[PDB]
Amino acid sequence: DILMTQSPSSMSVSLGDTVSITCHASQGISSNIGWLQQKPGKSFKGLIYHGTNLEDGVPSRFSGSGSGADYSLTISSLESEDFADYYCVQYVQFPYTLGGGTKLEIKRADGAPTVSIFPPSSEQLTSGGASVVCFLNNFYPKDINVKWKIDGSERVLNSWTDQDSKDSTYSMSSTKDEYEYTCEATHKTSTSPIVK
């Protein structure tokens, strides 16, 4: 097989910018490389074929460059609908390697999670179970650590959301005989572990 190593894994870019994603094959592929785009939650779209040639639609903002084993997809004056995923596929030889994948994100100026603690309900206990919820809303970026503390001792299912496109930030949620209570969180924003 051919090896495609496209870089970077992800990057946070502002609007109106010009970005370039690189793609590097383990051998020359003589410009038989295509570029694909997938919007969030939606399907894929072919943008570039045979190195520098453009697909149907495909505004002038997009372009391709490179040769040998090094190639580049370029966007200039980045538009709103460009924060998505992009891939470099190769068709020079079976099997199609398709490369690893690059993500685009909006660069924001940090954030502060509105972490709220949530003791268990009564009906949950009547059924028998016991679960304590810890919501952490509207923070940036994705990397963050959360710990639980039962009477001081560090002891759970975590779920993340993607960028709420309005505020451009993330959010996370962390969840009887044993039950009969602390949410230690650590974020880049605070040197000290804000907790509820």
Partner: protein, 206 residues
């Protein structure tokens, strides 16, 4: 021209499943049909490629024992059948449109969700706290997906964070509303499970 694909199926391990992708809007006769697997683990794998003019297959040696990529020109469709279907290879599957050498896959189909893991009504519980208070709605122990969670009659939409889901599913939703809206006025979490419809008004622990 933007294609179409089979609906999602809920299958058990060891079972064969067939997936459809119907070509309309262009000349189906002169386009290779590729298939691609995208998963949380090892995302965007290449299933393979077929020529519809003859039905010859050139699937890559990877797996290659679990998929068969037959096509039918008359109905203008391409099929992919998954045979092995282990528990871990649950993913979304795509049918692409290849034109030939010195070209790329241009048009893609919306995509099918396949889950091979081994009916449960939701367990809905309000989440009350102990200027802008956050309330919650916890949906524990339901099967299968999906569930729809709304607040009131769809009124409260801003400031809502509904997070994604032991062979059972766990879901939670948070809504941050000002200390004057709650508990002064009722907030009712509405949960629908396609034949369950439940309404939980949020009451403080005290």
């Amino acid at each position: 021209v933007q294609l179409q694909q089979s609906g999602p199926e809920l299958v058990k391990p060891g079972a064969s499943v067939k997936i459809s992708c119907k070509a309309s809007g262009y000349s189906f006769t002169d386009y290779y049909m590729n298939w691609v697997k995208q998963s949380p683990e090892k995302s965007l794998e290449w299933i393979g490629e077929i020529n519809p003019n003859t039905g010859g297959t050139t699937y890559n040696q990877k797996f290659k024992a679990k998929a068969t990529l037959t096509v039918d020109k008359s109905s203008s469709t391409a099929y992919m059948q998954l045979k092995s279907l282990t528990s871990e290879d649950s993913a979304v599957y795509y049918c692409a449109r290849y034109y030939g050498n010195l070209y790329a896959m241009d048009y893609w189909g919306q995509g099918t969700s396949v889950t091979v893991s081994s009916t449960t009504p939701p367990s809905v519980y309000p989440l009350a706290p102990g200027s802008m208070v956050t309330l919650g709605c916890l949906v524990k122990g339901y099967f299968p997906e999906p569930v729809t969670v709304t607040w009131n009659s769809g009124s409260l939409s801003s400031g809502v964070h509904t997070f994604p889901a032991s062979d059972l599913y766990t879901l939670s939703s948070s809504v941050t509303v000002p200390s004057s809206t709650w508990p002064s006025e009722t907030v009712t979490c509405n949960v629908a499970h396609p034949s369950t419809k439940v309404d939980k008004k949020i009451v403080p622990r005290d």
